Amino acid sequence: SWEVGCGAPVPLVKCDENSPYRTITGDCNNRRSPALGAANRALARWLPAEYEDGLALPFGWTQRKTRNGFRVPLAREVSNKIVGYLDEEGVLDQNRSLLFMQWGQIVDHDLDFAPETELGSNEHSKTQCEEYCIQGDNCFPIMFPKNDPKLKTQGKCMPFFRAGFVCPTPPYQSLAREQINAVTSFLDASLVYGSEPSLASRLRNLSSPLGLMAVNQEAWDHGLAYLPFNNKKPSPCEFINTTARVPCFLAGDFRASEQILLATAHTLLLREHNRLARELKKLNPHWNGEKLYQEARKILGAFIQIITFRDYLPIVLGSEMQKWIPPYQGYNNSVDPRISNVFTFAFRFGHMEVPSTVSRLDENYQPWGPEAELPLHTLFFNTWRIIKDGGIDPLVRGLLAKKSKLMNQDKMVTSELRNKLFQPTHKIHGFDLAAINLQRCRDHGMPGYNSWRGFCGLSQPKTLKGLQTVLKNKILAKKLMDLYKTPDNIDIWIGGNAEPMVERGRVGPLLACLLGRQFQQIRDGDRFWWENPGVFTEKQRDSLQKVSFSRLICDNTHITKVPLHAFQANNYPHDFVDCSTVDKLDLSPWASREN
Amino acid sequence: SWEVGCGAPVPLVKCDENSPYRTITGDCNNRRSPALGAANRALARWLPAEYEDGLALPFGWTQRKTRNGFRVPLAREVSNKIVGYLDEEGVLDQNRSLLFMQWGQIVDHDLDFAPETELGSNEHSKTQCEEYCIQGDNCFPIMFPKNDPKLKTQGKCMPFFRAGFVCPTPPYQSLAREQINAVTSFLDASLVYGSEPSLASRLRNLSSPLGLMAVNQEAWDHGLAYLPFNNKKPSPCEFINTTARVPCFLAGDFRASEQILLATAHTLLLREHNRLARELKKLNPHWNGEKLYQEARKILGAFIQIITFRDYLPIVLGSEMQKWIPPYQGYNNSVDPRISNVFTFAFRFGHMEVPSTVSRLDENYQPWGPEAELPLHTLFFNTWRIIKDGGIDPLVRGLLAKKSKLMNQDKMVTSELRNKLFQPTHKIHGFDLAAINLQRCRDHGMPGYNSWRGFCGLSQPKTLKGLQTVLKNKILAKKLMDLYKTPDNIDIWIGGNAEPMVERGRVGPLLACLLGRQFQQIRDGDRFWWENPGVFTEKQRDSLQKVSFSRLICDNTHITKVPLHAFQANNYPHDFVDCSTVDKLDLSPWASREN
């Protein structure tokens, strides 16, 4: 295969330096080095790649070959013996709403994507991998360990394809494999607008001069907009219920329809851009399509940044917030804005916050219809449950009123994700997200737990007792040692997520470090950061401070009661207030008379 | 596809319908369909695109793949074996001045521009294409044939970048790839004023309310104006002589400084707008900056149209003039005003009319200084030879008194263009304009010779003997067959230009058809055509008939003696008369009292 040898800039660079707007592609943000943070480039490395053969082959590729002396345990064996649990009772997070989980995934999709090597080329090398479990080239199968229930049910393996990667480049230098980030490293609403101008154009209402995003023309949510349907086949959203035959939504990000609440959040964000465009049309009738789009885009861009840094990261990082993301001291153009390879695994802490069910709630936040509570696994690539069952309002009430799953050392990932995950190109609700994470760490040539512990100036346990100490759990440490033999070999994803959460936070000290560092860098290293002088007026920045997720819902649904702080656990009706009481985004400071 | 929806970048501006002036962008000319003829749209297709893969990839992309059975020959091999010649003796056109050549290029640049995917000169992918000759994406290298002298001197290839294309500006294809026309399809002096309002504003003297175009403030031509300097770096005009360090001129068209006589013609046109503005200021003191600019612009607009249709096209099309451009029957709003893809190659007949030298002539039309006669290749992106060596007057005398090169089946393109062309982003006087033309036909998915022969209801030869008959040349036909194998595969540019010229014209029957059709359409389809009732008064149209290139020179240089008809071969002194004897543009009919 060797898909994408390189990698050279598909969209090139057109650095119009007097432009006050971000490029779609993230190009020209850093003037010294224009390609920093741009889409379809190599993920940054904070540490060098670690491969079996020093180059491309992941640890666990060759049966014989070991890692610091010891064999690497099968991903799925780690999943079963550490990450699995049966009893969904008492697992919910008492002080975080489901929106906490959902916003994590929205942010993640803005920041990074490392899609599978793109070509089958009308080929059965896709099925050759899946059907016959033959390791080779980009087929890197997850092998089931002995006694795995799925041996009886699914055969020898789950299929897995290695992430795409950059050049054999003209020097043809001996180089480590570097995975591509297909989206813009900047927090810039790229999941709404796209990370490539082909898509970004295709997503716009251009037949109208109002700088509107294209909306669905086949269905409506009580007069409120849905995303257009992706009519490209084969559609996995139609596959999951062939009777309903409802396609996936077309969005700025490839993964928008991956699960119903993600599609829902994508719907809120789209409605908000169009709401901003027709409000700026009233204030500035002389402004043309491009100007409305770009200003709406810039505002939405800043909304995501503010909600992320003011509301979201403080409750992720807790006691470590000020240590890693201090108060803002302005655009430092020598900071690397690019998303690191390791961050893409660090931010998968989200996977342990996803509970087993999604609720639809009515206008009194009571169960909506007969089947209010749906198991998560039925909502993978599910657009019909939106179009043909009540719109997004009942789902949005669910996000405010239901709880995220709490990370728990004895109950890590729900079987809805660990056993019943649906992958868009395969036929079965039978995959393991946790196994995929461990396999993917290896694919990406991830350094081990201690390598990253070291990188964060934290202790590097070499012993059962030393690990017991860091994890504050004897049975967990013992299980990890039985499988990995050394904490050096522990795959970063399970290692970071094994660490007890920090005070007032929702991740361990190691992930706090890794997340904190990256979030500091995408702020400080962003020339279009919202707080950077000259991006917005002082007037505009005063008005942008009032924004809230609560207000987003009010302005873009038919929901009237919302809580003041949407990310904390809020029960109806005590913790809810009327939409009329919530501060608004006053757009007066955008009013451009005598232009 | 996104078909019926596909749209690329554009300013998306609305229509002030009561405006009596052209938009900068060509928007709102056609009221039914406002975008027709506007800048930064798809070139029209008269026949469907023909690509290797039916979509985007040009014929000659894949070494393997063939065209109607036969492989397509390397562009450079066609250049060397057909288009080249050594002997510049007797090649001059004895009945056309050099202004004939120069006016062609001026008109061309008003009408169409399909710029390369714009490289920022900040990437390794620019040099990756140039240095390693690696075909991929927008790098489509011109490969040297074996025994080509440039192998020893320049490596394996000339670099070549594919023209930009619509909706997706990076690669996505389901409908055929359509190249952009970055200028206004209307004959409207857009090369003076710009095809985009950011530029058009930036080119004006706005700090004075006299509707003047900005002029050079660093240098003067015996008190007469030069265009401002293009401050954008790196400047290729200062690259060609780093001691002189003289930048390229800033004009309405990107290509103004491509060669010294083009820059010269751009200088005359600019001086004439300013001369019109300060004459209309005298006649109408109450008129403001906008009104002076727009009326000056409208007059100059009409000048170019009249010289083109009354003087230029008759001597291009000869016997075919009346057939294709009959007498004017008024604005037909159902005619397509857009420039076709194929026209942009048809109008490159100009390339075979460019002679090997440019002369500076003194006040007696004698050699000016010791180095009067300069080889053409030294005058690519050459502004210093104007600023620091005599101004434009000696060069303008050259245009009147020297001859255009004659198209010749045995002597097609001078080595000045065929071996020694300079490209603005590269370092060497080493490119081949003919090779680039053949490569560019393929890039633009051009149908073959016979496809266009057919489109013009002319015979479609399938044999050596049949081709010999059409070309009235045995050795040319034989060479074409040895390379292309079928006349079906012959690239439109070399095919049209191979055809013996029509009676008292300067192109063959095929180009007569293609040029004639397009010129008919940009007249008939233009709502602001100068002869269209209501654009000008009957009085104004009577005064506009007197204009001449001879008069333009008189009013805008320090030249005193000029011929009555500048496009014919005119020798000093018999055919020259005094400037006082030439009919003037009487601007009395623009006098607008009591407004």
Ligand code: MH0
């Ligand atoms: C708060 C963060 C977060 C949340 C919540 C989250 C929630 C979910 N996830 Fe998942 N997810 C998160 C962060 C990621 C990241 C960072 C990546 C890696 C992306 C990349 O390629 O760079 C990821 N998730 C990657 C994935 C992948 C791809 C795995 C691979 O091939 O390696 C899948 C299938 C996926 N998720 C599913 C889901 C589903 C389903 C949900 C919820 C129902």
Ligand code: MH0
């Ligand atoms: C009578 C017409 C005419 C004349 C004379 C003429 C004279 C010249 N030329 Fe050239 N040229 C003419 C008509 C064109 C056209 C129509 C185009 C295509 C433009 C477009 O993008 O739509 C063109 N020339 C395009 C070009 C290009 C771009 C080629 C490519 O990349 O595909 C170059 C470099 C160029 N010329 C050089 C020159 C030079 C140098 C001279 C004279 C000194």
Ligand SMILES: *[C@@H]1O[C@H](CO)[C@@H](O[C@@H]2O[C@H](CO)[C@@H](O[C@@H]3O[C@H](CO)[C@@H](O)[C@H](O)[C@@H]3O)[C@H](O)[C@H]2NC(C)=O)[C@H](O)[C@H]1NC(C)=O
């Ligand atoms: C692109 O934008 C244009 C307008 O900016 C959209 O066309 C507009 O579509 C709306 C429907 O969304 C139309 O309004 C409708 O009027 C009927 C008739 O009374 C009513 O049944 C509906 O409730 C609705 O109000 C409207 O005709 C039309 N506006 C204009 C100016 O044409 C177009 O749909 C957008 N396209 C995309 C892809 O988003």
Ligand SMILES: *[C@@H]1O[C@H](CO)[C@@H](O[C@@H]2O[C@H](CO)[C@@H](O[C@@H]3O[C@H](CO)[C@@H](O)[C@H](O)[C@@H]3O)[C@H](O)[C@H]2NC(C)=O)[C@H](O)[C@H]1NC(C)=O
């Ligand atoms: C040299 O160039 C000039 C181009 O202007 C040519 O002179 C012109 O020749 C044309 C033929 O295409 C003559 O057209 C004729 O016009 C008269 C009108 O009185 C008409 O009776 C004829 O039917 C014909 O249409 C034109 O008179 C003549 N013009 C001038 C000013 O001399 C000439 O043909 C070229 N010579 C060569 C050898 O190519």
Ligand SMILES: *[C@@H]1O[C@H](CO)[C@@H](O)[C@H](O)[C@H]1NC(C)=O
């Ligand atoms: C939940 O967290 C919020 C802010 O993170 C805090 O103000 C509140 O006291 C906490 N409440 C509970 C019940 O944990």
Ligand SMILES: *[C@@H]1O[C@H](CO)[C@@H](O)[C@H](O)[C@H]1NC(C)=O
């Ligand atoms: C599929 O869709 C129909 C309505 O479109 C619905 O009644 C049915 O319950 C769905 N089937 C499943 C498996 O959920």
Ligand SMILES: *[C@@H]1O[C@H](CO)[C@@H](O)[C@H](O)[C@H]1NC(C)=O
């Ligand atoms: C920018 O960040 C670097 C660390 O990469 C730091 O050394 C430097 O002090 C910062 N620059 C400024 C001006 O604060």
Ligand SMILES: *[C@@H]1O[C@H](CO)[C@@H](O)[C@H](O)[C@H]1NC(C)=O
């Ligand atoms: C503006 O107008 C004045 C007088 O008309 C003139 O001196 C000046 O050169 C113009 N400005 C520019 C930049 O050309």
Ligand SMILES: *[C@@H]1O[C@H](CO)[C@@H](O)[C@H](O)[C@H]1NC(C)=O
């Ligand atoms: C370069 O420019 C200078 C004027 O600055 C001129 O005298 C000299 O002859 C030029 N040299 C070349 C090599 O063109």
Ligand SMILES: *[C@@H]1O[C@H](CO)[C@@H](O)[C@H](O)[C@H]1NC(C)=O
């Ligand atoms: C106007 O345009 C159409 C060609 O598209 C043609 O059918 C019609 O005859 C034209 N009218 C005139 C007067 O040429």
Ligand SMILES: [Ca+2]
């Ligand atoms: Ca982004």
Ligand SMILES: [Ca+2]
């Ligand atoms: Ca034009």
Ligand SMILES: [Cl-]
């Ligand atoms: Cl065409």
